[PDB]
């Protein structure tokens, strides 16, 4: 079996940017997640006025 294909092996994590080739590196990988969450939340809020009304 190919270790580079399985997601849990360290070879895959090194050959796909998951692992440094340390905390700062992961924080750098996860930049902009907050913005994506905020955009999804804004879209969901603006796409369901009736549910907001029943919430009130």
């Amino acid at each position: 079996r190919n270790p580079r294909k399985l997601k849990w092996t360290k070879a895959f994590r090194k050959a796909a940017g998951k692992e440094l080739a340390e905390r700062a590196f992961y924080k750098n990988r996860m930049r902009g997640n907050k913005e994506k969450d905020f955009l999804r939340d804004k879209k969901l809020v603006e796409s369901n006025p009736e549910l907001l009304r029943i919430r009130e």
């Binding site: 692992e19 340390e22 905390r23 992961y26 924080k27 996860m30």
Partner: peptide
């Protein structure tokens, strides 16, 4: 070894 996890952030 494992690095940084999602919960550890």
């Amino acid at each position: 070894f494992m690095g940084t996890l999602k919960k550890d952030l």
